[PDB]
Design a protein. Structure first.
Lengths: 300, 33, 78, 83, 294
């Protein structure tokens, strides 16, 4: 009964060269900042948040994707693009054109992640309007929870080698991070170490936890002595390192410690949700020769 | 009564040594010996 | 009960299983061993539908009328 | 089967053209190998649908190592009931 | 298709006093117990768990709030209250009359919270029927977290006392607020803290050594806007752990487990059911949103 169609108009006609790149990916999943059918160009990519002049972000993109509505290309006509609307729990079809090429199989869980690789793999620059559309990095969830991790480790040891040369070996660092094993197969990713400014914010947060967490959990153990202590917490005293238990908490004052504990939790819920919950969808059928995967979208 | 539930924090058996009855049985046993 | 309660409720069911395992790691502490369990969401059931007992071969088997499925992620509880 | 059981799609690597591996919860009780007193009913029933536990362990040789590092909950995608 | 309507029978004619407050809040969200058309007034209030003589425990009240269905008022007739229903997933009009006022816009996100600032303002008592009605508070998700962040910190530092400016004040851009703590039952707010001692000391065991060495290179000279927590001095503990040499494949196993336990901290910092607002009108104070499932 309900009708859904998203038709984006433009001001100027497209070039003949840029039409072949949009015909290259006739099936894709774009993000889209509005739910209405008629819309301007400035929302349908990631150019609304991420740009060249602005500093590249991870988290403000990941805040954006869960808030944003997804859409799928059907037909590219100059100049009026034709997207199709994504509904909560709706069955539709996806062709998988994303650079670099990761292999999709059926009964995997698709996790939409922001692009953190090079530019020419991710985006297609529209010279007619002067605006950049950016296609997101669609990666299966177990890769997407692992392709981020080895790069985020790689960004830390890049910050150590730039501050001190003797602590990090490059051959130890390259061989263990840029090679990703999944489904029995391997993938050698593009490092782009030519100058990873995307993951600098996550490299700040996880480290600030790593100093404050063992400072945090000592005070939270000793403050909770009861006759009604939960009995599993008696076991986890053996898990904490012995060096952690030897903090003199007299050194930090009470006005310092309230600032720490509010800093302690406030990073935790802001960091947990940006690993956990984004626009994430399922696929029940796949064919390698047609490159078409029937999908269905589950919000939240 | 399960193998995985062996080291329960509140198991069903509780020791209860009634210290008055334990001293009287020591002291008679130290009288005969 | 909603997802905020049952994660605390599943910990009370598996209390003994947490305790009998983690007696071992006073001696050997392997970071690979610390992962314990996971919880998925198999989809909703409507309220007040009676699960009806059956018998097969014996094997007693419940049944849920009006079941609908909605799969979710695996989240690691401990 | 009683035509309404729950399922799981275990996935390791596409080795064949199209062969798939499915796990009923009676079958996953056999790959587990826990004691009888944890589930005193299904152990008799799941012992007669299958062998002693090596009929299904031949397909996944890593069942010792998939339990140590803890990757087994990442390889199951819940599917639903039979039709 | 589907209908949604709850009309509430009531055994006494309401006074003109209490009807003027109910006429003031014609667009409001209150939870209620059962799913029927006809309904007694003893389920409409949130005060079946939060009464006056009972000491309220705002974690257990918030724990209560995810169970119940939620409902929006349509009319206040002088005998019968009339409400409409919220089911996942359905688009519906919502209108904020909520007294500690915040400003929304299009493409914002919401949550439903128990009243944590002024109970006497956000609850009206009905002297005609003798049963009182308690209204929850709708909050955008950033302050939806940030109030729960302060209340978990507060029960930590009331037990150590066995002063108030650091423990009872929820901070936000432009405003500061006062939490309502005079009588709080800590026992349901401490079981959440009992699980926090479980997760946080496990995360102190698997700490990446390179990400500790990053702060020893950072906070001594390289000062950044968001590292002002340490005030320029390293903690004494961080120098102790960094005596080991760095190696990559140690941290690869560690950082995946660091990743996997931060998946669990969703379950302890949960809000109620969430509300993803797509269109919000400004001068009318109406909105439009789809109710999320729990």
């Amino acid at each position: 009964a309900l009708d859904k169609s998203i038709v984006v108009n433009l001001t100027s006609r497209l070039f003949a060269d840029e039409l072949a790149a949009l015909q290259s990916k006739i099936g894709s999943v774009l993000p889209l900042g509005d739910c209405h059918r008629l819309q301007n160009i400035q929302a349908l990519g990631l150019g609304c948040v991420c740009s060249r002049e602005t500093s590249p972000d991870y988290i403000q993109i990941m805040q954006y994707l869960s808030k944003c509505t997804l859409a799928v290309l059907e037909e590219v006509r100059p100049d009026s693009l034709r997207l199709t609307r994504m509904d909560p729990s709706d069955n539709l079809q996806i062709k998988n054109v994303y650079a670099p090429f990761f292999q999709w199989d059926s009964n995997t869980q698709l996790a939409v992640l922001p692009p953190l690789f090079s530019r020419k793999d991710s985006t297609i620059v529209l010279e007619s309007n002067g605006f950049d559309i950016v296609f997101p990095m669609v990666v299966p969830q177990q890769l997407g929870h692992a392709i981020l991790q080895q790069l985020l480790v790689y960004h830390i040891y890049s910050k150590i080698s730039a501050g001190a040369p003797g602590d990090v070996n490059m051959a130890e660092l390259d061989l263990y991070t840029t090679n990703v094993s999944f489904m029995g197969r391997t993938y050698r990713l593009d490092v782009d170490n030519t100058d990873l400014r995307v993951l600098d914010d996550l490299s700040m947060y996880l480290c600030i936890l790593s100093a404050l967490v063992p400072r945090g959990c000592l005070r939270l153990l000793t403050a909770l002595v009861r006759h009604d202590r939960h009995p599993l917490t008696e076991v986890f005293e053996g898990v904490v390192p012995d060096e952690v238990t030897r903090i003199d908490l007299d050194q930090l004052s009470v006005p310092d410690d309230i600032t720490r504990m509010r800093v302690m939790f406030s990073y935790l819920q802001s960091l947990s949700s940006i690993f956990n919950l984004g626009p994430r969808l399922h696929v029940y059928a796949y064919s390698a020769e047609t490159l078409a995967a029937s999908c269905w979208y589950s919000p939240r | 009564t399960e193998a995985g539930r062996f080291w329960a924090p509140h198991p069903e058996n509780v020791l209860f040594i009634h210290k008055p009855t334990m001293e009287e049985t020591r002291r008679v046993a130290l009288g005969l010996r | 009960k909603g997802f905020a309660e049952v994660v605390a409720m599943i910990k009370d069911h598996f209390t003994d299983v947490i305790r009998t395992k983690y007696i071992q790691l006073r001696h050997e502490l392997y970071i690979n061993r610390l992962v314990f369990g996971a919880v998925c969401t198999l989809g909703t059931v409507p309220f007040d539908s009676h699960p009806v007992h059956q018998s097969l071969n014996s094997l007693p088997v419940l049944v849920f009328a009006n079941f609908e499925a909605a799969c979710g992620p695996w989240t690691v509880f401990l | 089967e009683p035509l309404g059981t729950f399922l799981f799609s275990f996935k390791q690597e596409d080795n064949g053209s199209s062969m798939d591996m499915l796990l009923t919860p009676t079958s996953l009780f056999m790959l587990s190998g826990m004691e009888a007193a944890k589930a005193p009913q299904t152990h008799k029933v799941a012992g007669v649908w299958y062998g002693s536990g090596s009929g299904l362990a031949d397909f996944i040789p890593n069942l010792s190592e998939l339990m140590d590092t803890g990757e087994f909950h990442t390889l199951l995608t819940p599917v639903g009931p039979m039709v």
